[PDB]
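Entry 0007
Protein: Aha1 domain protein
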Amino acid sequence: ADLRLEREFAVAPEALFAWVSDGAKLLQWWGPEGLHVPADQHDLDFTRLGPWFSVMVNGEGQRYKVSGQVTHVKPPQSVGFTWGWHDDDDRRGAESHVMFIVEPCGARLILDHRELGDDEMSLRHEEGWTSSLRKLAAELALEH
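Output (structure tokens):
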């Protein structure tokens, strides 16, 4: 019910943080490879506190909506937000907390997702995040 992922990048921590907090940048790699978020419906931005949400659509038209609350935004340091998927009738279930933290070295990113349904879910999310980070990595290497 608790997962941890991390990767280093040849960019400046200031940059890495902007890439994991700014909506313009977030909307670039959000969601696993294969699915995207329609500009039509979302509020993906961890730059300020308050409600955040975002639906994802895959290559087959399947929609997935996840909501949350940005709990803390430490501009250079880190961000933290609430996590909850939505029902077939727009009803969010089990809630979790996601945290993106930087820390230079270049700069490395730590993704920590806790309080998930169980282990079988702590896996499904890990691979999901893993898949989604590939898109960030690529997005970064394109901006150098």
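Curator remark: Residues 94 and 105 are 35 Å apart (CA to CA). The longest helix spans residues 119-141.
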